[PDB]
Amino acid sequence: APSRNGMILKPHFHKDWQRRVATWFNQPARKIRRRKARQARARRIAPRPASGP
Amino acid sequence: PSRLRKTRKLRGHVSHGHGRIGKHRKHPGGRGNAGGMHHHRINFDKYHPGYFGKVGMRHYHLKRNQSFCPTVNLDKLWTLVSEQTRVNAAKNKTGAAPIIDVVRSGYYKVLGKGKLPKQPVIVKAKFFSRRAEEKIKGVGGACVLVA
Amino acid sequence: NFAELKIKRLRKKFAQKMLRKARRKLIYEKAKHYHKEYRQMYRTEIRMARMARKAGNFYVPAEPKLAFVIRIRGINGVSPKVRKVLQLLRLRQIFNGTFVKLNKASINMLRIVEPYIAWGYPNLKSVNELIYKRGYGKINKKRIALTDNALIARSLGKYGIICMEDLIHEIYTVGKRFKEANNFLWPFKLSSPRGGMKKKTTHFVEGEDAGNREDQINRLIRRMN
Amino acid sequence: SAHLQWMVVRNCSSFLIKRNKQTYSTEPNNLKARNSFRYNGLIHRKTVGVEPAADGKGVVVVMKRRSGQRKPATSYVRTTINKNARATLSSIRHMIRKNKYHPDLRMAAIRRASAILRSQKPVMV
Amino acid sequence: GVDIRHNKDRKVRRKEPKSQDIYLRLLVKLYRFLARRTNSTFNQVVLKRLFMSRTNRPPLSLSRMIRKMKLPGREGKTAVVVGTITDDVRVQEVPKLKVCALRVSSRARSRILKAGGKILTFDQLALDSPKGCGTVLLSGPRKGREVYRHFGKAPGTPHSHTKPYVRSKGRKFERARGRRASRGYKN
Amino acid sequence: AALRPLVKPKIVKKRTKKFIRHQSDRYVKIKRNWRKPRGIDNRVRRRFKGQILMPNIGYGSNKKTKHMLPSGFRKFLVHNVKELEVLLMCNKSYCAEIAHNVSSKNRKAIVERAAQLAIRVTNPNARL
RNA sequence: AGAGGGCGUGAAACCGUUAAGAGGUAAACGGGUGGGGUCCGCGCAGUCCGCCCGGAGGAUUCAACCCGGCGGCGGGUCCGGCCGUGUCGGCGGCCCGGCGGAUCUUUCCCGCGCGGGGGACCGUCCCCCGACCGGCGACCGGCCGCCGCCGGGCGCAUUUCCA
RNA sequence: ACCCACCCGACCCGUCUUGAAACACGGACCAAGGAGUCUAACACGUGCGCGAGUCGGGGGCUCGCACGAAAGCCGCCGUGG
RNA sequence: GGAGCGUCGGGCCCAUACCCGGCCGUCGCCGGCAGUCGAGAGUGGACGGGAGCGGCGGGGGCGGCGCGCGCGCGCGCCCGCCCCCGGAGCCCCGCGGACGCUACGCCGCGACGAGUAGGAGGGCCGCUGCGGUGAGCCUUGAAGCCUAGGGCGCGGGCCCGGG
Ligand SMILES: [Mg+2]
Ligand SMILES: [Mg+2]
Ligand SMILES: [Mg+2]
Ligand SMILES: [Mg+2]
Ligand SMILES: [Mg+2]
Ligand SMILES: [Mg+2]
Ligand SMILES: [Mg+2]
Ligand SMILES: [Mg+2]
Ligand SMILES: [Mg+2]
Ligand SMILES: [Mg+2]
Ligand SMILES: [Mg+2]
Ligand SMILES: [Mg+2]
Ligand SMILES: [Mg+2]
Ligand SMILES: [Mg+2]
Ligand SMILES: [Mg+2]
Ligand SMILES: [Mg+2]
Ligand SMILES: [Mg+2]
Ligand SMILES: [Mg+2]
Ligand SMILES: [Mg+2]
Ligand SMILES: [Mg+2]
Ligand SMILES: [Mg+2]
Ligand SMILES: [Mg+2]
């Protein structure tokens, strides 16, 4: 029940959302992995720009 | 910080701050915005005048970038450029007037709030107000349309 | 530098001591006058009646100016109109009392609080005994006991009231400056009535203690003060 | 400043010791062991400190220079006084009073020295 | 038993600042002293303001500080502001001012000093004038905060112009039954 | 001939018995430790005649003699020797308690040091 | 083994005993005293210490005073020099001072009208000396005054100690 | 603070209730366990930083992470909010 | 011949009410104290000429704004001084300032104090883990456990002794 003034607000937590929460504890581990993989690809394409084409 | 919160101070007391005549039952009003019309109506129509009902035209595939038109007021037009354009001017003695490309700085329209200092300009912009035009002319300048 | 200043400070010191002496002497003469004034008032009321009585006549003396008003019942279950007036007489606690100048307005306010108060026309002695034994100033809103005239003067001296004696004369004669001398006095916290009362709840006339008892408020004063 | 760093320190210093409804302070050159502004060795530009002598006989006064704090190595300047009690006090008195140095302290500095000279003598039965 | 209501016996005003920061607290120590020992009520007002909240000491714009000193007679003075001095990009020519502030933003600082302005801290103001003599005590607009536009007689209460808390403005966020005449009614 | 405190006034206590907890007598599960009752009817919590008393700030100690031991001192729980030297400049007003957990060798080391400085110890003749 | 093979510590409920005390209004409780126990602090005078003083006894060395040395403080003449704030003079760092700029110039250079770099210009940051002023806890050097320590001298109407 | 005595006082708590010592319910006793949490969104208050701006994400550059899945920096500093 | 009923006296009895006093807390005081004169405060101080027992010859006011501890004064000798706290000796001291001053401290005056539901503040109350920090404690005995032992705190609780 609403009590005296406030946004009549609609949250979208009626489905079973806690079954599909996606945490981000990866992200540092991820960020590194990309970065290694990046440095490897440079080293493979030896004098070619790391960039791409 | 649980340490600071209220339930630490309620420990010992029976009702936990929810009273003992009426209690803390689950959902006595109904869940959420239930009763907007019936039984919660007064709150809705004294803090949300106009919740209920349709109005105006539908618009199916709205794409916001078509209507993109960020405005800027004369108020702070000279802010767009380095002070030393506004200084090398009120000086110079050619009656030059420096250009101000407003679209470069990220505003499309030029509306007309504020006093513009007596110091000629050439304002390039996608759109202008009527008043913004007038003020600009009164300074001794020239509005300039750009695509 | 040194001996010039010292003498200047000694001079200052003396000029104070002189003034103190002076104001003391004023106080002393002011009393002496008020002694003569109350004497003259007392006799010249008797003077009058005797002279009426000499003729086949009557001397109806003045209706009283001033009355002491004691709150004689407690602070539970008391009507809102009464309660308001009782806190317009500053009679909040039970057995608090105040002087009150009489007039059509004032008297009727006492009429609206009758079964909550005992009151009437205080003696000279009553005004003294109340002021000397239980005379407390309102001095920066702190109930403070009138230990010296430096207190009374500091507050009421802008009215010509510079000592306990002056105060007593302002209260008792109900002078111009009564409102300001009477409000200066913090309401009199008197003890319980020694020897007891007759009956709290009923009027004086009908055996009890409440209401106007005119002369007899002085007996009650002595057994409470 | 003095005051600024007292704001930083007043409740947090390692030298402080609350407990048992009192408070105290263990920082050196605090005569009276108080967690006070006045009586704090570390904070003030000019400081007094009356410790006992390591010998076991006598007292050391510990002035602080003003020359250069920033350089704690050089900052304090110690001075043993190992004299006939009554003398010891007077030397401390003059150090404090006639140098106009920390005049606020001084009587506390005398009582400390006194208590220290009490400490170091044949004890009891 | 006595009849008084003990209801509004405790006054709710602040005494110290609620902040724990040490530099402000030194200013408070200084202005407590001055407040009590000087007759100047300037010190009292200043002291009072040092205890107030961020909200309660709003920023004073440069243009607002200009125009308040432009006023006739308060010339060769010092403006004082327990809040912060901010820039106005929509003012150009800045006269040479004298200013006290707890803060001045980096732009506002430049503009003032470029003009030949002097900026003072509050410890500096005290030494300069311990009884607040020859000062202009200003304040920022208290009721600037967008907050206040929701305060008052509620929306949907005839003759109120009180912003409702709404998730997002647009065609279909409110503006139906209770604003149009066409839809029920209007207030 | 023990260490006299500086000033040995008359301590005067408002209440000597422990406030005990309602129905701590009747039940082994309830402990003496005071608890305010919050029961809707409760003889005690509504101050009837003849019941167990409720602690107020009314019973409070006089500030001069609050925490004052019978001897006249206040405790200060010393933990090692270095911690004593604090009391050096009080001694006439504070005494030293030594902690339970301190060893019987260095209990001794504290006690003799306090005896130099004339700080009274509140549990000296003990560990041995 | 007061760790004995479901055995570290071993709470409470509950039970056994041992000791003490009580006992016809179920017990238990609050307030107030009394009596008894348990221990705890004493005293085999607790007359508790500390200043200062006066006296009578013993005790070593110095305070006071200078002299030599060291260290510290404080001071102004800012005296001499280092130090730094505001201002003015050098246009002097300006290219031997860099960044920033929608200020300018493509008279320049290089790379392809644009990019990069110079070159002007403005804003900002640094050298030179003189002058005025806040002479600022930012330091040195001499001089002064004062303090303290060490070492010399001072032998006893001073000097501490002890009872 | 252990026990005993005596005078005065004194019904059993919890709870719902206008009203509980109740012939209203729960409760033989003790131990351990045991109930206003976290996420999201809003609003107001307060504290701090910056201020016509502010912002940090997401991404990236710096390390084998001992402490690091931190810390730092970014014409990304602002795509964008 | 009331210990009954109606009318009335004196006298005495006691509530957490009233009065006085103690002590605790809360509220209030534009409260006080970062080191100064001063109690109806109603000035202080240069400094220059002219002078001196002169003064400011104003109300039965009973009086506050002016008067009798000095203004000039004792000493050096009509003329000079009327001097400095590193010393006036102090009830006020403006030359420097607590035993006191964790300024979230310390101190002073008044007033007040029922409380369910509910709200807020403070807890040197309590539990477990983390960064700091205690040259912490601990086999010369930690945690826990038990205790007719000693205490503190209004209380949450806490500290010591013994086992
Ligand atoms: Mg890529
Ligand atoms: Mg609630
Ligand atoms: Mg309930
Ligand atoms: Mg409800
Ligand atoms: Mg009644
Ligand atoms: Mg009635
Ligand atoms: Mg209340
Ligand atoms: Mg009830
Ligand atoms: Mg074992
Ligand atoms: Mg076992
Ligand atoms: Mg084991
Ligand atoms: Mg038996
Ligand atoms: Mg029900
Ligand atoms: Mg019912
Ligand atoms: Mg019940
Ligand atoms: Mg029944
Ligand atoms: Mg039921
Ligand atoms: Mg049952
Ligand atoms: Mg449990
Ligand atoms: Mg906010
Ligand atoms: Mg209450
Ligand atoms: Mg409650």
Residues with Cβ within 8 Å of residue E5, at least 6 apart in sequence: none
Distance CA F20, CA F30 (A): 10
Chain D residues with CB under 8 Å of E20 CB are none
Contacts of A10 in chain E (CB under 8 A): 167
Interacting residues of C50 by C-beta distance below 8 A, sequence separation 6+: none
DSSP C39-64: HHHHHHHHHHHHHHHHTT----PPPP
CB-count burial class (<10 Å; 0-12, 13-18, 19+) for D63: buried
Can you tell me the distance from the alpha carbon of E104 to that of E109, in angstroms, rounded to the nearest whole number? 6
Amino acid at F99: A
* Cβ-contact C134, C190 below 8 angstroms: yes
d(CA D107, CA C220): 62
Q: Report the alpha-carbon distance of residue E171 to residue B53 in Å, rounded.
A: 11
Any idea which residue has 């006058």 for tokens?
C33
How many C-beta atoms surround the C-beta of residue D25 within 10 A? 20
Rounded distance between C-alpha atoms, residue C215 and residue C120, angstroms: 7
Q: H/E/C letters for each residue in B103-116? A: HHHCCCEEECCCCC
Phi, psi of F96 (to 5 degrees): -115, 120
Specify which residues D79 forms β-bridges with.
D61
Structure tokens given for C50? 């005797």
Tell me the backbone φ, ψ of residue A35, rounded to 5 degrees: -60, -45
The DSSP bridge pattern shows strands E60-61 and E118-120 to be: unpaired
DSSP chain D: -HHHHHHHHTTT-TTEE--TT--EE--TT-TT---SSSS-TTT-SS---EEEPTTSSSEEEEEE-SS-TT-HHHHEEEEEE-S-THHHHHHHHHHHHTTT-SGGGHHHHHHHHHHHHHHSS----
Amino acid identity for residue D36 in this structure:
S
Cα–Cα distance for residue pair F115/D46, rounded to 1 Å: 33
Sequence-separated (6 or more) residues with CB below 8 Å from residue C205: C211
Distance CA C41, CA C65 (A): 14
Nucleotide closest to E145 measured between CA and C1': H44
Following CA atoms E9, E14, E16, E17 in sequence, which dihedral angle do they give, to the nearest 10 degrees?
A: 160
| Partner residues linked to B145 by β-bridges | B125
Q: Is B42 on the interface with E (CB under 8 A)?
A: no
Do the beta carbons of residue D124 and residue F115 sit within 8 Å? yes
D85 CB inside 7 Å of strand G: yes
Give the contacts of B69 (CB within 8 A, at least 6 positions apart).
B108, B109, B126, B127
Q: What is chain F's length? A: 128
**Deposited resolution, Å:** 3.5
The answer to whether residues B51 and B44 touch, using CB atoms and an 8 Å cutoff, is yes
Half-sphere exposure of E186 (CA within 13 A, CB side): 9
Return the half-sphere exposure (C-beta side, CA atoms, 13 A cut-off) of residue B23. Answer: 4
Please measure the distance between the N-terminal and C-terminal CA atoms of chain F and give it in whole angstroms. 22
* F95 closest CA partner among F65, F118, F112, F66: F118
- Residue of B25, B43, B44, B51 for testing the chain A interface, max A β-carbons within 10 Å: B43
Cβ–Cβ gap A8/B33 under 8 Å: yes
User: What is the distance, to the nearest Å, from the Cα of residue A32 to the centroid of all Cα atoms in its chain?
Assistant: 14
Q: Tell me the two tokens of residue B34.
A: 């239930």
CA distances from B138 to B46, B98, B126, E59, E180 (A): 48, 16, 20, 34, 41
Cβ atoms of residues C66 and C171 within 8 Å:
yes
State the CB neighbour count (10 A cutoff) for residue A53: 4
Angle, vertex CA D66, rays to CA D60 and CA D70, nearest 5: 100
The CA distance from E125 to E119, in Å, is 10
The first and second tokens of residue F70, run together, are: 């019978």
| B50 in Cβ contact with E178 (< 8 Å) | yes
Label residue E131 exposed, middle or buried (CB < 10 Å: 0-12, 13-18, 19+). middle
DSSP one-letter code for C55: T
- Residue C168, burial from CB neighbour count under 10 angstroms (0-12, 13-18, 19+): buried
What's the longest Cα–Cα distance across chain D? 51
Whole-angstrom distance, CA of residue A5 vs CA of residue C224: 60
Q: What is the Cα–Cα distance from F93 to B136, expressed in whole angstroms?
A: 84
Alpha carbon distance E134, E37 (integer Å): 19
Count CB-CB contacts under 10 A for residue C63. Answer: 8
Residue A19 is classified by DSSP as G
Task: Determine the Cα–Cα distance for residues C20 and B127; give it in Å rounded to an integer.
Answer: 88
Cβ contacts of E7 within 8 Å, gap of 6 or more: none
What is the C-alpha R_g of chain C?
Answer: 22
The C-alpha atoms of residue E164 and residue E155 are separated, in whole angstroms, by 6
**Lookup: tokens for D29:** 């050159």
Which residues of chain E have a CB within 8 Å of the CB of D8? 22
Cβ of residue D77 near strand G, that is under 7 Å? yes
Q: Indicate yes or no: strand G within 7 A of the C-beta of F49.
A: no
CA of B41, closest CA in chain A: separation in Å?
Answer: 10
**β-strands C211-212, C117-120: how paired?**
parallel
Helices marked H in chain A: 27-44
Give the number of residues written for chain D: 125
Contact B107, B130 (CB under 8 A): no
Q: How many Å lie between the alpha carbon of B93 and the closest alpha carbon of chain E?
A: 20
Give the separation between CA F78 and CA F83, rounded to whole angstroms: 6
- Which residue of A3, A7, A12 is the best one to mutate when testing the E interface, meaning the one whose CB has the most E CBs within 10 A? A7
Q: Quick one: residue E82, left, alpha or beta (phi over 0 = left, psi -120 to 50 = alpha)? A: alpha
Chain B residues within 8 A of A13 when measuring between CB atoms: none
Q: Of all helices (H) and strands (E), which one includes residue B142? A: strand B142-145
Here the tokens at position B35 are 């009763």
Residue E90 is given by DSSP the state T
Helix H or strand E segment including C69: strand C66-71
Chain E closest-CA separation from residue C116 CA (Å): 14
Query: What CA–CA distances, in Å, run from F39 to B12, B14, F50?
Result: 11, 9, 18
Q: Which structural technique was applied? A: cryo-EM
Q: How far apart are CA B75 and CA B85, in angstroms?
A: 17
- Torsion sign (Cα): D29, E24, E74, E87: positive
| Gap from CA of A4 to ligand 2 centroid (Å) | 16
Kindly determine whether residue E178 and residue B49, on different chains, have CB atoms separated by under 8 Å: yes
- Asked whether residue D45's C-beta has any atom of DNA/RNA strand I within 7 A, the reply is no
